[PDB]
Design an enzyme around this catalytic site. Structure first.
Site, PDB file in Angstrom:
ATOM      1  N   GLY A  57     -16.185 -34.233  39.312  1.00 61.12           N
ATOM      2  CA  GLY A  57     -16.889 -33.971  38.065  1.00 61.12           C
ATOM      3  C   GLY A  57     -16.238 -32.926  37.171  1.00 61.12           C
TER       4      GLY A  57
ATOM      5  N   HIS B 236     -19.794 -28.909  40.901  1.00 67.30           N
ATOM      6  CA  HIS B 236     -19.494 -30.103  41.707  1.00 67.30           C
ATOM      7  C   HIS B 236     -18.342 -29.930  42.693  1.00 67.30           C
ATOM      8  CE1 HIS B 236     -22.409 -32.455  39.641  1.00 67.30           C
ATOM      9  NE2 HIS B 236     -21.763 -32.463  38.489  1.00 67.30           N
TER      10      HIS B 236
END
Ligand SMILES: Cc1ccc(C(=O)NO)cc1NC(=O)c1ccccc1
Ligand SMILES: Cc1ccc(C(=O)NO)cc1NC(=O)c1ccccc1
Ligand SMILES: Cc1ccc(C(=O)NO)cc1NC(=O)c1ccccc1
Ligand SMILES: Cc1ccc(C(=O)NO)cc1NC(=O)c1ccccc1
Ligand SMILES: [K+]
Ligand SMILES: [K+]
Ligand SMILES: [K+]
Ligand SMILES: [K+]
Ligand SMILES: [K+]
Ligand SMILES: [K+]
Ligand SMILES: [K+]
Ligand SMILES: [K+]
Ligand SMILES: [Zn+2]
Ligand SMILES: [Zn+2]
Ligand SMILES: [Zn+2]
Ligand SMILES: [Zn+2]
Lengths: 415, 397, 395, 412
Positions: B149, B141
């Protein structure tokens, strides 16, 4: 008597590694070209009476299985055919790969440094020399069962083991290399009679990653009976001769006052030099401002303690030779009380052309609040007080205080 | 040769995060408790010769200011002081907050995975290994200048950028979440085709990888080069396998990749606390993951296998132990017999109360997606002048 | 040949500042009124292929964030609104305030002097010119990350850096009323650039350095003994100033044997400068400035002549016109007869009410400084293992 | 009829300078290798009946003394005294505009091609003429500049604008400000100049941007408001550059109603140019160049297309080969399909490692817009119409900008 480790087969072996090339030959020939060799007692590398006694020497620290693998790796690289899949896996299980590759003399190359450093320790033990230099030694990263950082066999651990085992004996180990001496520190982690001290660079991603901080962060400093016996001064990049000198001087003198070592072992790796390809520290070999190396070596020698001086890192081979030739002439001056004058121009000899474009002895480099490390001084002195306390040694607060008070810093010394 | 990334210090750093705690130690201890380590070539994490060298390696993707912010964040959390308002502002501008908090080893933790996945890519490039496993990596991410994330540094992007510079790369993202950071990084690049399968639903992290109404799929020369298969909750081993299998086969045929990179996030497991998909670690139906790794491995392309999500730590360890044994079977040919009972070891009591290797689980929209994805593959092969039997590939579905 | 930096764009930029106004136009147009331009080779200001190349050139000495701040200061002064409090703090931290204010062209103005002085270094290096003049340059007070004394970019340091990297040793001679601290500071650790500034120094007088510090600092590291200073008391005249620096210049030449000479020629030592500190003139019967330039040119070393201070604009034009004619004469070997009256031209009214080329003016400590400087020269040559006849020098 | 300036001696002279080497040969040979030459009417460079007729042609713009010095510099390099050195530096015949054995023949050749091209437009032999050996827009009356020694654009425009109410629109797409053409016509309302370019502190040549609040100079006397400039920051791509000049070009065509259009099509805005300033491409599914050329040709106004800068020589040839095929397509209505692989020819090896026609570049992306420049430029256009007593068709200009949503920028 100042000793130095050399020999014909020793120089061929030392010069047979892919990473270090002919560096040892440059060093010894520059020392030779400045006419220092007559001042020095040649210390022949140790040889053994059988593979068994040799295997017994090396396995005082290293595992038998890792030694066998290092030997097999040498035999494999001396034959044309490739490693089998099982050969590959066995070598990788010992990190005998990547940055510690095999090559046709990898075992003989690694053993030669052990032969040199063990012979050097023996010359100190029987009081043949007051100081012994081994510019082929100093491989401080090698582990009991692991090669690391082009260190396959840890001559330093083996030389120290022989010093402590000679007939209340304490060794002080001082690691000036750009890198943390993790291999020596790990070997004596649980031992109070070998006090290790490494000054070095540490930052995230930087090899090998230890010798620095680990609830606030903390410094691990040895365990068990070894608690407080492992000292570290990690420094930021860019440090010059004077700040490095100011950083370790009082620490070196305080360690000597409290540990009272019977022998000092100094790893003197040259990758702190400003012109080293690492480009991290900015030390010089200058000698009238002053090389932090020469400053530290002069201070250690002034303690009048039998000392082993080892090489190590250093990847600008001509500048490594310039620095270690000066370290060698200094050692002769300090021990023999004999003035050694070294001409600024590199003398005629067969590697003269490698000292270009200047052919001078000084490295070709121009040196030019908040970066201070006074909390490290305070941390390290409190660690020294704990070590003395745990080991029931005199801790002479007044002598340590007066020392630091020379620089107006007595207030950092604990009682 | 199958490599696996590990080391003492590396294990210490992978276990120092507040969100993944000691998961990497459980994984590597179950692998070792099953006597798999002697079969595997240890790949050590990369280390650098200077601060400048590390910075040069990381700002090959990330912005220098984002790297300075992240290292500043570590120094602040190694002090006892609260951040100033100005430093809260700086960290907020890099999303170094909320789900991406600071902690005392946040920079060494993040970099460790980059070191791990960079060494794994190097080992594949010089052909030391046929496959490398890094269960400490897979942080798909992170963006150029932004944490996301719990991913602070995108080790996958850096490893792909190292392989594609030594040449096409196929990236395969099995994680429950859309691999948006990897897909974004190579959005304009035809030589890195990304394929993520994932859950997507309104408000579900991170929100991309689905209808946007139409599907975006790359831009510039990279048009049609980002592939996505979103799925509803509840999907089991067999349907997940059937949705992904033909797409994997067609991408390999048409792209003919020089390297395959697999993110193998374990949060699709039915026992993950997300409780979204119903995949298993069963090796007899067959685990969705094991089916997928086995298919990708069947291609005999040099392959990176990375971790990622997975918030039930013993079950992630159970899944990734099976993936490790399977990779050893498929690459060496050497049959791997794994006892169904968790062997005794340090973390043995985490595998309670049953101590079995199997996880404790009792088990049309997709056809329209296959139509659209095959059309996009055709478009990609068109635009990139690639040569492929559209009828052999059409038969795969 | 003899080169002079000019150009229409250059002239417009050099005349765009609030502090030096149209001085550069008065200088160049007196030079033209006296028919000296046909004797001179025009050196165009350097231009770069890209923003990155310009940045790489200027950050050879200045920090990038300082260059960024300077370009931001220009943008802000091309907007109508006030600076934010945060922008004010930013500029303060690089001393972009007080006597180094912003104005609409402060970056293009500063950079132009760099363009001219780098072009002049290059004309010397390729050997197109033996001497080059840049009366738009000479901003010796700028530091790595700090404006000072209306100097925003140190064009001398960048020119000198280009010349040493062309073994090369550069002699920098600073005749400005003020100590050239920025140039001195830039090469403090470098023995290949020997700096000599003569100047007024007295308590509270800008910028404060170039004098007892007590002892004289003079370089550090391998640059020790390589920064020379001669501070002088107010009121000194052409002949006392000339005798003060004359022997120091000759000794530096003999001992350093420089590969280039860079001469900052600030005109604020003139008797008629509003500083009213020194009593030097532009008289060529003798002007201390012409004496030193003629001495320096007699050495036949490729030479960079730069401007600097000078706050009576027509009188700076009078001196710099004479310096130019002399450089032509001394280099080409070809007499330059300059009328004692100002020729008619666009700026003729500025030379009133008398309109004459001569400026309108009726005209032991140093022995201690000579002995200090001669000893420091000996330390310099000894530290740098330079061979030289000590007795020949001491004479 | 699309014309193109070419000839054997012309190729030789255009290939004889140190700075541009064989660039003109790669260009014409790639056009030849894609088989575009049979579609084009070769326009031979102009030759004169005497040295005096030549010198008269060239000193319609350049001073006598500058031409004389330029002849001498070439004669000198075919065999310098200190006064020859001074003489040459007085004309900037130095540094970036050095002498070489053919410096005058080289410079004259581009004049010969652009004037012949102008002549073919004037007499209606061609609707469009290309000259890839021309476009040297920096040369001044008495001064060489930026490797421009004679200004062929100025001389060509002067021939067009004096042929039998006549206005010329000059459009300079080169990376650099067209200072030489702009200065020549600064006092003349019948030649309207428009340059789009990079401008930043220290970047050559320094004009074409801002000069109490800074201002744009835009002509003087009868030429007030007749010189247009659009300076752009570095990094602009094909679409932002297309959106930046499209409406300005259409509005300039609407208001000015030019009898001829002259386009300088210098290639140093390419992403792969060594300058690395702009990120334009030669792509054609869209290249800003091809976009702007397609737009100019749609006005159906007799047009001259010139070369200019471009220092990646294969990529310059890839761009200009696309410009040439598009002109054939747009003017003759005849589809020109160009294959993605470079065809076989003597310079094939110069297009490596890919040997493809698309330049080897990978494109990749509020506050960077330039809507205040549009407003400034449209206001200047309205001022030009007023001063010169031309109809300003507000509604048509407004409809043009309201296609984007920007009608509000158009002045009444
Ligand atoms: C990778 C490594 C590992 C250990 C040591 C070392 O000297 N430790 O003491 C040095 C290195 N450095 C290097 O191998 C090196 C060589 C040249 C340039 C930059 C780096
Ligand atoms: C918030 C978030 C963000 C990213 C990822 C992830 O695994 N991405 O690949 C996972 C999460 N999920 C979680 O962190 C989580 C943990 C425990 C229970 C339920 C959810
Ligand atoms: C404040 C300052 C700072 C630097 C310099 C200078 O010329 N340095 O070279 C000159 C000055 N002097 C002045 O700015 C000045 C101007 C007019 C009358 C009196 C003084
Ligand atoms: C110095 C110059 C002067 C004028 C022009 C130009 O093309 N004007 O239109 C271009 C240049 N650029 C260059 O000469 C150049 C060439 C190769 C690499 C980088 C720069
Ligand atoms: K060390
Ligand atoms: K110890
Ligand atoms: K996924
Ligand atoms: K892609
Ligand atoms: K001065
Ligand atoms: K100096
Ligand atoms: K242009
Ligand atoms: K005009
Ligand atoms: Zn080292
Ligand atoms: Zn996930
Ligand atoms: Zn001054
Ligand atoms: Zn150009």
């Amino acid at each position: 008597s100042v000793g130095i480790v050399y020999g014909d087969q020793y120089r061929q072996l030392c010069c047979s590694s892919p990473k270090f090339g002919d560096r040892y030959a440059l060093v010894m020939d520059l020392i030779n070209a400045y006419k220092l060799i007559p001042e020095l007692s040649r210390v022949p590398p140790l040889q053994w009476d059988s593979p068994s006694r040799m295997y017994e020497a090396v396995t005082a620290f290293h595992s038998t299985e890792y030694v066998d693998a290092l030997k097999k790796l040498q035999m494999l690289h001396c034959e044309e055919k490739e490693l089998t899949a099982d050969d590959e896996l066995l070598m990788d299980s010992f990190s005998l790969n990547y940055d510690c590759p095999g090559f046709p003399s990898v075992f003989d190359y690694s053993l030669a440094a052990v032969q040199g450093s063990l012979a050097a320790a023996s010359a100190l033990i029987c009081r043949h020399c007051e100081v012994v230099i081994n510019w082929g030694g100093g491989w401080h990263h090698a582990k009991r069962s692991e090669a690391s950082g082009f260190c396959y066999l840890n001559d330093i651990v083996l030389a120290i083991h022989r010093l402590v085992s000679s007939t209340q004996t304490r060794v002080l180990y001082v690691d000036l290399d750009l890198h943390h001496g993790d291999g020596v520190e790990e070997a004596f982690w649980y031992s109070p009679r070998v006090v290790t001290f490494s000054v070095h660079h540490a930052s995230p991603g930087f090899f090998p990653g230890t010798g620095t901080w680990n609830k606030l962060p903390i410094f691990l400093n040895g365990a068990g009976r070894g608690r407080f016996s492992a000292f570290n001064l990690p420094l930021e990049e860019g440090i010059n001769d004077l700040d490095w000198s100011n950083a370790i001087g009082p620490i070196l003198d305080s360690l000597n006052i409290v540990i009272q070592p019977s022998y000092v072992v100094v790893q003197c790796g040259a990758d702190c030099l400003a012109t080293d390809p690492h480009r991290i520290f900015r030390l010089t070999n200058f000698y009238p401002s002053l090389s932090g190396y020469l400053y530290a070596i002069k201070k250690i020698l002034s303690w009048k303690v039998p000392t082993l001086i080892l090489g190590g890192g250093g990847y600008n081979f001509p500048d490594t030779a310039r620095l270690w030739t000066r370290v060698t002439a200094l050692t002769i001056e300090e021990v023999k009380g004999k003035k050694m004058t070294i001409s600024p121009e590199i003398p005629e000899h067969s590697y003269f052309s490698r000292y270009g474009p200047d052919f001078e002895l000084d490295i070709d480099y121009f040196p030019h609040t908040l970066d201070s490390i006074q909390k490290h001084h305070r941390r390290i002195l409190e660690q020294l007080r704990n070590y003395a306390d745990l080991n029931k040694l005199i801790y002479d607060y007044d002598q340590v205080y007066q020392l630091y008070n020379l620089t107006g810093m007595g207030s950092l010394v604990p009682r």
